Structure 1
Amino acid sequence: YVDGEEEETIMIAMTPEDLQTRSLNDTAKRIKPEMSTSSHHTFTHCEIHPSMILGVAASIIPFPDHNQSPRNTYQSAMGKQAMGVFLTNYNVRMDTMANILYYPQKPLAKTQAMEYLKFRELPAGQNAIVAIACYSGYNQ
């Protein structure tokens, strides 16, 4: 374990394919830096997974790494206002606000992290059909 004070005195690579110095020019992938400054590094730490830098209302988002980050902040601060299933005992509980969304689907862009907020077993929305096309000015 490290807290923010030992974060001062460490040296991280991000993914375990970057620990061994790797092998091109393919226009699909992503470009890690070379880290050719230290010829002989002493890495002491490597991340378990980078999508573990997120918050709980942030790991829900499908591919956060392809957006303009105010929209990431907006999606995380809207994910809390989903209609869905809040706890499974809404028969006996008496609460001043409760709303069940009828037909909740686990998203086809699930993560690997949504196993650990159970959201694939309690979702709060649906898959409906996207069609990004100006049709009659109603989506101006």
Structure 2
Amino acid sequence: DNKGELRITKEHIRKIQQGYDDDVYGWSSLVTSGVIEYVDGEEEETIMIAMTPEDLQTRSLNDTAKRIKPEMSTSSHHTFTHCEIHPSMILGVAASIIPFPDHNQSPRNTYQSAMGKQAMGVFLTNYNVRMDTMANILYYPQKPLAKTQAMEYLKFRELPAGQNAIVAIACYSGYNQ
């Protein structure tokens, strides 16, 4: 009767929190253990994915605050066999930077991950010794506020390249046309 339910119980999160097995225990041990498996470009044909682990159970109104998932109205008894980790992991390494990406029009995501990769900033913490043809250090960097859960991994907050200024969206004297 585990059916429908995920296989990574809270046991596993606890262990991964300690960092050791309760008689090293990291990622590859997850995979080889039996709770995450790899799918490639093809096998991803013949499987079934729920978006977030909240859609395993047949989910059950009409308040205007959240977003509209499909309820799965085809099968009165479905058969999932895979469930995403978290779909904010479809973006690229230069696109998780966009904060609240999904409230946008894609041509803007595109200009983003084609401009953020030109930010003046602090690229490696040893500009003193490297002697390179260009480099550019911005004086006073600032980790920004609209962080994701991924700048917890791109070190972008220990190494930002941008600043926070008071933006006032209001035509003023026509110089900003």
Distance 1:15 1:36 in 2: 17
User: How far has the Cα of 1:16 moved from its partner?
Assistant: 1.1
User: How far has the Cα of 1:23 moved from its partner?
Assistant: 2.4
Bigger strand fraction: 1
Number of aligned pairs?
Answer: 140
Provide the residue aligned with 2:61 in structure 1.
24
Please tell me whether Structure 1 or Structure 2 has the larger radius of gyration of its CA atoms.
2
User: What CA deviation, in whole Å up to 9, does each residue of 1:4-44 have, x standing for no partner?
Assistant: 11111111111111112222111111110111102211111
Q: Point out 4+ residue stretches in structure 1 off by more than 4 angstroms.
A: none
**Identity value in percent:** 100
- Determine whether 1:100 maps to 2:137: yes
Structure 1 stretch 90-99 or stretch 14-23: which is displaced more?
14-23
Stretches of structure 2 that go unaligned for 5 or more consecutive residues are 1-37
Secondary structure of the equivalent of 1:51? Answer: helix
Maintained 8 Å contact 2:60/2:71: no
User: How far has the Cα of 1:71 moved from its partner?
Assistant: 0.3
More RCO (CA 8 Å, sep 6+): 1
- TM-score (norm. length: structure 1): 0.97
Instruction: Say what the alpha-carbon RMSD is for the aligned residues.
Output: 0.8
Stretches of structure 1 that go unaligned for 5 or more consecutive residues are none
Secondary structure of the equivalent of 2:165? Answer: strand
Secondary structure of the equivalent of 2:88? Answer: helix
Structure 1 stretch 23-32 or stretch 79-88: which is displaced more?
23-32
Provide the residue aligned with 2:151 in structure 1.
114
Structure 1 stretch 57-66 or stretch 31-40: which is displaced more?
31-40
Structure 1 stretch 128-137 or stretch 20-29: which is displaced more?
20-29
User: How far has the Cα of 1:97 moved from its partner?
Assistant: 0.8
Distance 2:59 2:71 in 1: 9
Maintained 8 Å contact 2:143/2:157: yes
Distance 2:67 2:139 in 1: 40
Provide the residue aligned with 1:45 in structure 2.
82
Secondary structure of the equivalent of 1:17? Answer: helix
User: How far has the Cα of 1:65 moved from its partner?
Assistant: 0.4
User: What CA deviation, in whole Å up to 9, does each residue of 1:77-128 have, x standing for no partner?
Assistant: 1110001011001110000010001111111101110011000110001110
